[PDB]
RNA sequence: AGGACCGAACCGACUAAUGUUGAAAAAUUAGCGGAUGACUUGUGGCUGGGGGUGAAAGGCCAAUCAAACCGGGAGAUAGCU
RNA sequence: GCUCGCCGGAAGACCAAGGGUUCCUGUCCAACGUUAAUCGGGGCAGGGUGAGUCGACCCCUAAGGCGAGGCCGAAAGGCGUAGUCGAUGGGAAACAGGUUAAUAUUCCUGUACUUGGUGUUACUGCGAAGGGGGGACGGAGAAGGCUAUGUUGGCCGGGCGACGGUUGUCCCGGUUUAAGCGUGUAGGCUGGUUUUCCAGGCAAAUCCGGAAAAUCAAGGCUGAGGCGUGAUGACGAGGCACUACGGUGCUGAAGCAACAAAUGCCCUGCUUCCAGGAAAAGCCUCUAAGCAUCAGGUAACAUCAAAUCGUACCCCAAACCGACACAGGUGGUCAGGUAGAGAAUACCAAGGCGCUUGAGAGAACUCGGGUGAAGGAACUAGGCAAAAUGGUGCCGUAACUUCGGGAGAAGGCACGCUGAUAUGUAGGUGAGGUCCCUCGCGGAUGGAGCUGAAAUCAGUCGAAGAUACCAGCUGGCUGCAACUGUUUAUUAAAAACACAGCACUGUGCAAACACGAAAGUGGACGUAUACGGUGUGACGCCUGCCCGGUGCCGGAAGGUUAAU
């Protein structure tokens, strides 16, 4: 099993957008920003054990950071990971 | 059978083929084949060491039995095959215990023909046996120079070696060069002469034929600049020098043997 | 017209990359001069 | 712009081309020299 | 069948005109040669500087080649400007 | 938004490489955009890339790299065995439909498939850095069977028409459906089965190889496509209801046949030719050591797992390489209509564009073109440039020749449209029916239907019927080079280089020779019918004399002659 100390550090934020919103209200999937080194077994286990719901399957993409600039000083943001967590028929959050 | 091609399209005007209807039209025997990668004339330093080599057709190596070690077991010649690595043809043979091997094909040898290696072999063409058992004045090919080593003399097509003497532990051999050489008399040799003599009668006809045997062009020395070849330069055709290699050593006469280790074994140089 | 720089990442790295500078004496001296000059990117890796 | 202007002034500083004056300028100087001989 | 014939792709580059502070540090347009072969091409690899490679022109080796580029000896030396 | 023009083997679509947010939405016009800009690949913010099946990673290897020991080398280091890496190659598996502003073989719907783990049950000999098979692989050519795809008819829905006619031999549109599973066909290959024996596959072997018999004449392997199912589902021209007029839902007819047909598939086939055409693993098998009522193997069922990284967007380009939003360069994949031999060319479809300065005027002159009286190379260094020729069929065709050519020599004639032969022939395809059955994806007959050259005769139109585009100028004498090729990237493509062929010469294998302080490597896993060097340069007739000089080869007597 995955230890609970690992399993708390994985989920990072709920992702709020309109693709996320239509995924919830149309296909049971909650979209959430996860740890960059988090595997699909860790995300599945962490939503099973931290929101106490039943997860059908996880799909993970990794989002690349945008090169912004302040003034005349550039900088890339930071890569993050986004997990499309497809729940079962019985869920709320 | 040599055949002049009819002169449709130049390039075919001067070609003479050497066709052989008794060669096997088909794939060779597979577990006696191996990969033979082409080099380009270039050593482990990458450099061109032998010039004029490169390109040509892909070839697979055929493990030809030069040693002829299966003594006393007869072998029937299964077929004859084209070998790309040699001038001669190779015969695929089948020993009585179910082992196939390729040998160099001697002159008269056809399919369905008994050959036999070893000391008590009959003297007839195809039988490898030591030269203390071969009669003096017999044509013999695939000669070993050290006993047990493998054949190295008279392997190329239409080539034989005549045994002229048996003085003691040595046999004096008239090599195809014209050179008289002493070989130890325990060295095996195969009877007869090796058999695609008409190989020398083919004429190739065009430039691309040389190209497809892997022979890149030869720029002649006098066509170069003086930095390139010792022959070099000169305002139209201009030779004026004693003819040399591209490294300055005299071509046209100058003897380049220095061994001193194998001079014991040379009875007379060639002429 | 076909210019000289025809890029390939795999040849960039196999040729001038870090594991290829570290692979020999003189490339390690290259990295030593780039570190000593103090240089934001040593090799060309990414 | 200043960096591109310094480098793009630095373009024909190490040239070789002999029929072109200063590396780039077309002329007839081959025929002028050749006719002078 | 063919280093076969005509001819597109594809490779090339014979002529002319334009262009020559170009649209382009070598092209465009109209014709032109090869076009199953000694062809052409993709990806990778190997050869290195008095060295490579060269169907040989002193050609090519990163718009550089009768000896690359970078750094150093080095503020070479300059009876010359 | 309506018209107009351009590309349409691309100026459309999909990628690889390369780039790296340029993608999509809102917002701003300072600078960037060769002008203005409300617009933008610009600024700012937000959003966006979803995989057991696609690709990478992974398993295996080529060229080649690195390389424990090792051999070698003043040191650095060179080479290399075991090994280990290295794709551009070999290895398991997913398709259709729908959806987002922006992803989709990834999400959703439906239907699937693959490989491992574990468990149960039934049977059971399993077991390798080892043996065998297989993987496993050339160029060209030829058909045959198909399909993608298209055309026409039928069917279904809609229209009867701004200007003469248009209820019909009329017009517009649609007529689509996959993987998987089942069947096993047109082909292609091979005799099959049983028993005994063996100097081979380092050992063993029931596997492979081999040698005997005996019997049967068939079995096996492979294989496009079709057919059935998937699918009483989806999709579907269009209508219906609301309509932030952007669309959003609902409903939805027919959904067939004939012919033509690939450069795709059977085909890694078949025929043929020399120039003789990767490897290793997965895969199938054999056993050795061992384990043998255990472990393991096989089969069925159930259950679990299939991680990680890529996925946006451009990709013949305003996003890559070219300093530029540059008339340049850049690999693969798809490839509709009409005419055509065709991927040429013309005009078009799908789709995409009008090239990020415009408005005038209508001088010289320059550039790109059109036409030209009479003449017709007089131009000029030179017919440079332009003009001309140009297709298919048939007739006809010289010198010379290596007997192949020359030759498309040269030079001519025919060509449209309509009608008849013949309400479209010869030919191709071929239904229903009929006959037989080793009964079906069968063969024989039969010709409905579809497709359809080419020729002759008759007529008719125009100045002209290869009407556009496309598409040889021809002949005579001669120098050089035999020929195809190669070369000065960027003023020289040539008579120069190359070449087949010839000769001379070296080279006996630890070969000469070359790269290398050496080890070693190439020569070559070649062996004098071979290899290296040099010259000449197809072929035909030939290649004369000179060995005093320089070189080379040979000789050893004498003279001179180093280190010692």
UniProtKB/Swiss-Prot annotation, chain B:
InterPro entries reported in the protein's UniProt record: NA-bd_OB-fold, Rib_uL2_dom2, Ribosomal_uL2, Ribosomal_uL2_bac/org-type, Ribosomal_uL2_C, Ribosomal_uL2_CS, Ribosomal_uL2_dom3, Ribosomal_uL2_RNA-bd_dom
Pfam families the UniProt entry points to: Ribosomal_L2, Ribosomal_L2_C
Cystine connections: none
Keyword set, alphabetical order: Acetylation, Ribonucleoprotein, Ribosomal protein, RNA-binding, rRNA-binding
CC per GO annotation: cytoplasm; cytosol; cytosolic large ribosomal subunit; DnaA-L2 complex
Keyword Acetylation: yes
Low complexity compositional bias, start-end: 38-47
GO MF annotations in UniProt: RNA binding; rRNA binding; structural constituent of ribosome; transferase activity; zinc ion binding
GO BP terms: cytoplasmic translation; negative regulation of DNA-templated DNA replication initiation; ribosomal large subunit assembly
Region (Disordered): 27-52, 220-271
Residue numbers of N6-acetyllysine PTMs: 241
Reported function: One of the primary rRNA binding proteins. Located near the base of the L1 stalk, it is probably also mobile. Required for association of the 30S and 50S subunits to form the 70S ribosome, for tRNA binding and peptide bond formation. It has been suggested to have peptidyltransferase activity; this is highly controversial.
Extra remark: This protein can be partially replaced in vivo by its H.marismortui (HmaL2) or human (L8, from the 60S cytoplasmic ribosome) homolog.
Subunit (UniProt): Part of the 50S ribosomal subunit. Forms a bridge to the 30S subunit in the 70S ribosome, contacting the 16S rRNA. Interacts weakly with S6 in one of the 3.5 A resolved structures. In pull-down experiments interacts with CedA.
Family according to the record: Belongs to the universal ribosomal protein uL2 family.
Protein name (record): Large ribosomal subunit protein uL2
Organism placement in taxonomy: Bacteria, Pseudomonadati, Pseudomonadota, Gammaproteobacteria, Enterobacterales
Curated annotation (Swiss-Prot), chain C:
Alphabetized UniProt keyword annotations: Ribonucleoprotein, Ribosomal protein
Keyword match Ribonucleoprotein: yes
GO biological process, one term: cytoplasmic translation
KW Ribonucleoprotein (keyword) present: yes
GO MF term (any one): structural constituent of ribosome
InterPro entries for this protein: Ribosomal_bL34, Ribosomal_bL34_CS
GO cellular component, one term: cytoplasm
UniProt cross-references to HAMAP family, sorted A to Z: Ribosomal_bL34
Family designation: Belongs to the bacterial ribosomal protein bL34 family.
Cited PANTHER family: LARGE RIBOSOMAL SUBUNIT PROTEIN BL34M (PTHR14503:SF4), MITOCHONDRIAL RIBOSOMAL PROTEIN 34 FAMILY MEMBER (PTHR14503)
Subunit structure: Part of the 50S ribosomal subunit.
Protein name: Large ribosomal subunit protein bL34
